[PDB]
Structures are given as C-alpha cells and as structure tokens.
Amino acid sequence: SHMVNIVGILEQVNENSLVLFDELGAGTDPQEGAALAMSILDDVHRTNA
Amino acid sequence: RVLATTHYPELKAYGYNREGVMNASVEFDIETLSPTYKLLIGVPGRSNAFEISKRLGLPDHIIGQAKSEMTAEHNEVDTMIASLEQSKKRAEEELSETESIRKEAEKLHKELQQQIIELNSKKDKMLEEAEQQAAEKVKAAMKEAED
Amino acid sequence: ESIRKEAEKLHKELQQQIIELNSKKDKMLEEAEQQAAEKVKAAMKEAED
Amino acid sequence: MNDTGFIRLKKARHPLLPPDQVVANDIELGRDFSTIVITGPNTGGKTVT
Amino acid sequence: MQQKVLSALEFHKVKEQVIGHAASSLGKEMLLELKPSASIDEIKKQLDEVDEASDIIRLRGQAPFGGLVDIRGALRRAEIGSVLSPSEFTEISGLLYAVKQMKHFITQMAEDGVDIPLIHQHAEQLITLSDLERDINSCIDDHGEVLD
C-alpha cells in the first residue's frame, strides 16, 4: 500500500511540491527497505521538491 | 522448545550456524502478491521487496539503484533461495501432473481387469450355449435315425 | 520425471492391451460362432450320411 | 501425548481460522532440533504459525 | 498455565466452538472449566475418549441428549428431606428419560462388530430407575384422573 502510494507520488512530484514520508521501505527486509528508501529519496530530491 | 519469528537478514542464517537449531520460513507467492501460508522447514525466507515494488509499478532505474546499495552477499542469498524455491515449485508441478497420470493409469488398469472378467464370463456362457445346442441337435438326429 | 515416464509407458501399454483385448474378443467370438456352425454342419452331414 | 517435549502436528490447521482459508502445515519440534527460527518478511502468517 | 496466554490466544473462543456442539448444558459445564494440564495420564485418557467417541459419531449413530438438564439443586433438596416441586420432578424425569434413551442407544449400538469397553461400561452403570420414572409420570401430571 505504501509502495503503491509512493509510485503515485513519484509520477506527480515537482520542484513546487511538499512531500512527507513516514518510515520509507518499512514492512520488509531492513536492508532492502533502506536501499529502496535511499533510491526513492534520491529520485524525489533531484526534483528539488 | 522454542519457535521464533524474524525479518532480519542476520537471522536468515542464524540456525545453520548452530547445533539443535532449525531455520524455516513461510512461503509467499509474488505472482499473486499473496502468502501461501506454507511452512518450509529447512528453507529460509527470501526478501522480495524490489520484485513486489516492480509488480506494483516502481521504476526499474530506482530498483537498479537500490540493488547497487546492497552488499554482494545479500544479492546472492535471495537469488539462491529463489533458485531452490523454483526447483521445488518445478518438482511440485511435475509431481501434480505425475499424480494425474498415475490416477488415470490406475483407472485404466481397473477397467482392463473388469473387461477381462466380463470377457471370460461371456466366453464361458457362449461355449456352454454352443455345447447345449450341439447336444440337442445330436439328440434330434439320433431320434430321426432310430425312427 | 522417471516415474512419470514409466507411468506414461504403462498407460500406453494398457491402452494398447485394451485395443488388443477388444480385437481378440471380436475374433474369439467369431471363431466360437464358426466352430459352433461347423459342429452343427458336421452333425447334420453325419445325420444325412 | 508425551513427557519428552516432542511435537509433530501433521497438517496442522489454526483452530480459529475459517476451514476454507486455513492452510494445513506439518509442524514438528523437539527431536532433531529444540529451536526453530522462522525467517523472512512479515507477510507469511509467521504470527499465525 | 498462564491465564493471560490463554486470553491472548483466544483459547476461550476455541472452547466456544466446542460449546456450540454440545447437546446439553452438562457438556458445557465440562467445557467451561476446560484448561491445559501436565498430568499425562488423564490427558491421554481424555484424548482417547474423544477419539473413540469420534469413531462413534463418524461410523455409528448420534447419542441423544434431549430433555437432559441439571438436577443438582433438585437432588440436594430431595436429599435433605425437603419436598420438591413438580418442576424438579420434571427435570429428574427428563434425566431418567435420557438415561433410558441412552441405554436404548447403546443397546442398539452394541450389535455391530467390535464393542468398545468404555461405552459398554457406561451402559451397564446405568441402572433401572424406571419405578421412580413411572411414579413421576403418574404423580406430577396436572390432570387429576390419573392422580386418582
């Protein structure tokens, strides 16, 4: 559910956006969760959101 | 007697390093995104976060970057479990086909046994009817010769 | 896979035996009808003689 | 029943799950090993097990 | 065993699925007090009894228990010499009626192959209490013509 919502956020985010993320990549293996979370944060950070 | 549960890539390996400890997992079907609830004694639980994320629409460049933040050992372990689990899936599917063929062969064997019994019974009856008809005709001919 | 190949072979052999048993049935019925007809005809000829 | 602390629940079903949804499992403990650790993400019904 | 563990696992809900399968309140009285134990022998006897009764309920007939209620207050009030009501006598009559139908049910069930010793023992423990039953059926009825 978080991943479906995150995918929907990634399709629509821009430099004029606020984005709020609670526990990115929770509910799975901590290493895969942390790796997902870093890559999602880098993707969003490049938009200057 | 201990039963414990974990989602930590350390404890994925915990029991194999220890005497009198078993490592297990409960199976997940990524193709339906649903748990099968099947307890695999001896098989430890792979993580599937990226494969689930891809099936939910997460971009391949994000998954490719996240997989580059992982250690070389992490990527081997979950792939080896997937190869084991796929080999087990293949064994189970080919066994289910084999059970179907075995049930058909057992049915065909019962049908053949029943047909052999019916054939022997029909043969014995026709031989008895033919012997009776021959005996009646000989008796009729002997009577005509006596006359 | 080995058990599957043996089961498929046995299934083919049983199917072939059903075909052969049906053919032997039809022939044994015809031979029994002919032997009955010949015994009848021999008994009729011995009576005629 | 035994005093040796041995368990072998053949095709065990959770007693409060619906009979149409409950998956049957062979659960065995206290023979070749005294501890099981159920590894993997929080999806599989690890809690139900 | 820890009552908090029995509570957190919903062990009372497990018992409730069995309580719904009871024909009388007496099996419910044995079910409400049901808890785990470490005795071994009485545990083994209990699971052997439900297995044997599972073979009865899977292969043979269903044991009737209709009209069977608890007569504890009635039997205690009759014991101390206090005269009972006809409702207490009705409960005792339904109890003896259930005794009679269970005797008949084991009498019908005993004609098959392999007779089990526990149900046979429970059958031959039930004694002919039909004089008291006939007295109650002829004495607590509300029409006076039989009461005469």
Sign of CA dihedral E26, E31, E37, E42: positive
Residue D39, H or E segment: strand D35-39
B23: which 2 tokens?
């490592």
Quote the CA–CA distance of B66 and A28 in Å, as a whole number: 14
Nearest CA in chain B to C27: B123
The helix/strand/coil state of E39 is coil
Quote the CA–CA distance of C15 and C2 in Å, as a whole number: 20
Q: Please list, residue by residue across B94-122, b when 16 or more beta carbons sit within 10 angstroms of its beta carbon and e when fewer do.
A: eeeebeebbeebeebeeeeeeeeeebeee
Task: State the smallest CA–CA distance between residue A13 and chain D in angstroms.
Answer: 29
Using alpha carbons, list the distances in angstroms from residue D41 to A29, B44, D25, E28: 6, 11, 19, 41
Quote the CA–CA distance of A5 and D9 in Å, as a whole number: 41
B35 DSSP β-pair partners: B28
Nearest CA in chain B to A6: B58
**Rounded to the nearest 5°, which phi and psi values hold at B29?**
-95, 100
Asked if A touches D (at least 3 Cβ pairs < 8 angstroms), the answer reads yes
Using alpha carbons, list the distances in angstroms from residue B110 to B68, B105, B116: 60, 9, 10
Do B29 and B8 form a contact (C-beta atoms < 8 A)? no
Quote the CA–CA distance of B100 and B102 in Å, as a whole number: 5
Compute the radius of gyration of chain C from its Cα atoms. 21
Beta-carbon contacts below 8 Å between A and B:
62
Number of CB atoms found within 10 A of residue E54's CB: 10
Using alpha carbons, list the distances in angstroms from residue B97 to B104, B105, C8: 11, 12, 11
Q: Which residues are CB-neighbours of C46 under 8 A, at least 6 positions away?
A: B141
Angle at A9 between CA A8 and CA A11, to 5 degrees: 65
Query: Strands B2-5 and B34-41, how do they pair?
Result: unpaired
Do B39 and D13 form a contact (C-beta atoms < 8 A)? no
Which residue among C7, C40, C47 places its CB closest to the CB of B102? C7
Task: State the smallest CA–CA distance between residue B129 and chain C in angstroms.
Answer: 9
Q: For this experimental structure, what is the resolution in angstroms? A: 5.1
Quote the CA–CA distance of B93 and B88 in Å, as a whole number: 9
The helix/strand/coil state of D27 is strand
Do E67 and E97 form a contact (C-beta atoms < 8 A)? yes
Interchain proximity D1–E13, CB inside 8 Å: no
Q: Residue E10: left if φ>0, alpha if ψ -120 to 50, beta else—which one?
A: left
Number of DSSP helices (H) and strands (E) in chain B, helices first: 3, 3
A39: which 2 tokens?
């890559």
End-to-end CA distance of chain B: 102
Determine what percent of chain A falls in helix, strand and coil, rounding each to the nearest 5. Answer: 50, 0, 50
Quote the CA–CA distance of B96 and B94 in Å, as a whole number: 6
Tell me the residues of A at the D interface, defined by beta carbons under 8 Å apart.
Answer: 27-29
Residues of A in contact with B28 (CB under 8 A): none
B5 DSSP β-pair partners: D38
Q: What SS3 string covers B10-50?
A: CCCCCCCCCCCEEEEEEEEECCCCEEEEEEEECCCCCCCHH
